């Protein structure tokens, strides 16, 4: 080690700490929501507190931190992350004991957590611009993309530790170390269970303090705001690349948020041993292509454009592997088994289920032996049911030509589709593995191009403003508009106990497939068009 | 990685 490799070790440890902090935030939210007895809007305000605290100070710390001692401010920010991690687990330590206490036949402690999220927002401020500028200003020429691939590979260790510690600490009770465990009457499958959410934030806070330790032992060298912000914003290639990476990252975010719901509606499977080493090998392979081939600035830009072309070339093959529409009574066709419907809004009742006085808004999916799913066992005509095996006898809403055996023997749940589109589901997950591998080969080039576009005195400000646009308009508003364009195609709306915004149970699978592939595909096509404009104007400039 | 969000700053 020549000292600078110690900075890469400390930056790898800080990336492990920030990835761990994000997985611990996204993992233990239901224990906080059940423990503090707060509503959905309040716990969403807790969850958005981190984005508020990061987005408020990211541009000012990324501007003012580059002139100062950079790894000292990274250590100060990681210590602030550790203080927030201790402060998030701190409401467990002084509120006392936690207290918790269908046949279908025809209270103000959360502000602590809020402040901890704000502190953790400051804890994710100084790491990503400043030290990456410290990679580009002090490593040798061509070595920096290899270091970016190395730290993006080592930052995947953090979600693995986050999943393992989240599942292990959600296994036991919240009050372990204080009560006798034989007195607990509830299970982890019970609705009143609260896992040990504080152990997650305690390991996150102490690991952030140990990651804040070795930054203070590194040397500074191994051997106005408005005018500078105007000089960044009036650069046309930079703002074109920021709008480009905003469209591409927004396509990625709106893709992978709803892949498992697309699996549940289209291919019928409920919701990564191999996936995370594939992504880590993709990032390290892309860093090795940029390092080994001695690519210049427009070469890195054409390499990112070629990975975008390759990823979109397999992304457009999702349209040809669609399975059929599911057969549901009362949503896509009538209850009697004969006639389709024009629309799913306020369907008429049939003669078989007219005597059945159950709730039409109640959702409990069953299917018969004909392969047609029914939305409730009351509207399936089933009058008697058995128990660990599932059987609904004497169902009267399945009309055939006098078959005696085709009136009963129905189980619960969505029974799966034919075997023709299970192989198409395997094709979908194989092409998704290929698309995520080519997105990983895209990878470090988005970070690597920014420090070569802008001036060498303003690399950290450019990285901070790019982090503002990517984390702000991609991380927040893009799940909102993909959620709007996905939930506009619901077919069975759930009547919630409180009010509106209930999660719809099933979808119109071809229409939801069309809108979910279409918005992401048009966003990626417009992003690729902005790559072609960027290559043409960037070769014109160079 | 998995997931949701992105970045790619994570996973």
């Amino acid at each position: 080690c020549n000292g600078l490799k110690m900075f890469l070790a400390a930056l790898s440890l800080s990336f492990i700490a920030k990835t761990l902090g994000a997985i611990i935030m996204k993992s233990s939210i239901i224990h906080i929501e059940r423990r503090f007895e707060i509503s959905s809007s309040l716990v969403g305000f807790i969850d958005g507190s981190f984005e508020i605290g990061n987005l408020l100070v990211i541009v000012f710390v990324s501007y003012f931190g580059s002139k100062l001692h950079r790894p000292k401010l990274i250590g100060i920010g990681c210590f602030i992350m550790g203080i927030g991690g201790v402060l998030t687990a701190l409401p467990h330590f002084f509120m006392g004991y936690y207290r918790y206490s269908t046949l279908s036949t025809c209270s103000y402690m959360w502000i602590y957590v809020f402040m901890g999220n704000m502190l953790r927002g400051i804890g994710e401020t100084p790491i990503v611009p400043l030290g990456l500028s410290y990679i580009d200003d002090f490593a040798k020429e061509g070595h920096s993309s290899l270091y970016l691939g190395i730290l993006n590979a080592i930052a995947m260790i953090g979600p693995i530790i986050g999943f393992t510690l989240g599942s292990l600490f959600s296994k036991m009770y919240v009050d372990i170390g204080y009560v006798d465990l034989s007195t607990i009457r509830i299970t982890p499958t019970d609705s009143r269970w609260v896992g040990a959410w504080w152990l997650n934030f305690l390991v996150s806070g102490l690991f952030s303090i140990i990651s804040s330790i070795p930054f203070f032992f590194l040397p500074q060298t191994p051997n106005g705001f408005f005018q500078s912000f105007k000089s960044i914003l009036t650069n046309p290639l930079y703002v074109m690349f920021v709008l480009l990476t905003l469209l591409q990252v927004s396509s990625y975010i709106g893709a992978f948020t709803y892949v498992f719901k697309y699996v549940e509606q289209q291919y019928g499977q409920p919701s990564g041993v191999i996936t995370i080493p594939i992504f880590a090998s993709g990032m390290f392979l892309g860093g090795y292509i940029i390092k080994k081939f001695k690519l210049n600035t427009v070469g890195i830009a054409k390499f990112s454009c070629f990975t975008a072309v390759m990823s979109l070339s397999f992304y457009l093959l999702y349209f040809f592997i669609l399975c059929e529409n599911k057969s549901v009574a009362g949503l896509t066709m009538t209850y009697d088994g004969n006639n389709p419907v024009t629309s799913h809004r306020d369907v008429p009742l049939s003669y078989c289920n007219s005597d059945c006085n159950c709730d039409e808004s109640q959702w409990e999916p069953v299917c018969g032996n004909n392969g047609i799913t029914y939305i409730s066992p009351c509207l399936a005509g089933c009058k008697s049911s058995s128990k660990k095996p599932i059987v609904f006898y004497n169902c009267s809403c399945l009309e055939v030509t006098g078959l005696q055996n085709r009136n009963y023997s129905a189980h619960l749940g969505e029974c799966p589709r034919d075997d023709a589109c299970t192989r198409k589901f395997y094709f979908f997950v194989a092409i998704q593995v290929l698309n995520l591998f080519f997105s990983a080969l895209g990878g470090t080039s988005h970070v690597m191009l920014i420090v070569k576009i802008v001036q060498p005195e303003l690399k950290s400000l450019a990285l901070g403003f790019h982090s503002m646009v990517i984390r702000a308009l991609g991380g927040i508003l893009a799940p909102i508009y993909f959620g709007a364009l996905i939930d506009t195609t619901c077919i069975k709306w759930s009547t919630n106990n409180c009010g509106t915004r209930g999660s719809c149970r099933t979808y119109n699978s071809t229409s939801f497939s069309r809108v979910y592939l279409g918005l992401s595909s048009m966003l990626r096509v417009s992003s690729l068009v902005l790559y072609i404009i960027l290559i043409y104007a960037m070769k014109k400039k160079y | 990685x998995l997931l949701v969000t992105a970045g790619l700053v994570l996973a």
């Binding site: 330590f93 002084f94 509120m95 006392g96 004991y97 207290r99 103000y108 402690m109 204080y178 | -």
Partner: protein, 120 residues
């Protein structure tokens, strides 16, 4: 706060007759208990610790049991640093010992005196 642990002592226990009234207090010595929720449990003869009352850091949020609701009252005193338990319109089911609880770091319990009531 240079202290060893939190000492909890309560006062105001005694004998009451029929549906009367009683006034319990619990003062804490040692570590500052200002940030801590402070709880009041009940131990009957032959049963476990039944939870009765809880008070917040500033007394903003009050938690009460469903069995004793609307007649009990719990409050704070930050300068005296003592929690107050008014108890009115009594029943013979409250014949028990009443315990004081704080969690500055570790769980801490009190001694408790008899809050035995008479039947009338």
């Amino acid at each position: 706060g240079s202290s060893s642990q939190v000492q909890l002592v309560e006062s105001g226990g005694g004998l009451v007759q029929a549906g009367g009234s009683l006034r319990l207090s619990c003062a804490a010595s040692g570590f500052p208990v200002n940030l801590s929720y402070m709880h009041w449990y009940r131990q009957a003869p032959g049963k476990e610790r039944e939870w009765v009352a809880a008070i917040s850091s500033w007394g903003w949020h009050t938690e009460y049991a469903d069995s004793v609701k609307g007649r009990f009252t719990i409050s704070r005193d930050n300068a005296k640093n003592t929690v107050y338990l008014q108890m009115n319109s009594l029943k013979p089911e409250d014949t028990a010992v009443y315990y004081c609880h704080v969690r500055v770091g570790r769980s801490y319990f009190g001694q408790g005196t008899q809050v035995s009531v008479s039947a009338g």
